[PDB]
RNA sequence: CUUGAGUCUCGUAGAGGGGGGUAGAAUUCCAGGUGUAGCGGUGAAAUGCGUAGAGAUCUGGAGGAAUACCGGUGGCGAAGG
């Protein structure tokens, strides 16, 4: 019967507020979330979000 | 003789020259924390770097060159500068 709702296993750390850094360049854009005291909390990128080619340096790819 | 040319005091502007020190931003490298799979590159790509933990990100150190903006048809210089 059962068909699932929860998106992941239960939350970890839990910090309420953070800093993000967007390193935007002519070939690729990297978005990296951190804590105020300097800790990566996760990242994703245009190239890792499955664009490649010329699409890798586009505002639409940056969004995704 | 004194208009030429030289000379004296008072001042002014400027990256003019030489010798010493010093400060910040940044690329780099080493060190350590976080953190996950690409990163880097182009017309597109591959070689490269990456699952031995890179890229990004926070801290600290090392070093060496240059010295943003101001800077402008600007200015100084015998010219190169």
Data resolution in angstroms: 3.6
Nucleotide nearest to A54 (CA to C1'): B44
Is residue A9's beta carbon less than 7 angstroms from any atom in nucleic acid strand B? no
B chain positions with any atom within 7 Å of a protein CB: 33-45, 54-59
**What are the Cα distances from residue A41, in Å, to A31, A44, A46, A50?**
11, 11, 18, 21
Give the integer Cα–Cα distance in Å for A57 and A34: 23
Write the DSSP string, A8-49: SS---S--S--EEEEEE-SS-EEEEEEETTTEEEEEEETGGG
Contact A46, A61 (CB under 8 A): yes
Give the integer Cα–Cα distance in Å for A24 and A30: 7
Measured in angstroms, what separates residue A39's CA from nucleotide B30's C1'? 21
Contact A48, A56 (CB under 8 A): no
Is residue A64's beta carbon less than 7 angstroms from any atom in nucleic acid strand B? no
- Cβ density class A10-27: b for 16+ within 10 Å, e for less: eeeeeeeeeeeeeeeeee
């Amino acid at each position: 019967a059962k068909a699932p709702i929860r998106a992941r296993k239960r939350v970890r750390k839990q910090v309420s507020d953070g800093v993000a850094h967007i390193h935007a360049s002519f070939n690729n854009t990297i978005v990296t979330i951190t804590d105020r005291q300097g800790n990566a909390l996760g990242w994703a990128t245009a190239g890792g979000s499955g664009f490649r080619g010329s699409r890798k340096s586009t505002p639409f790819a940056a969004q995704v």
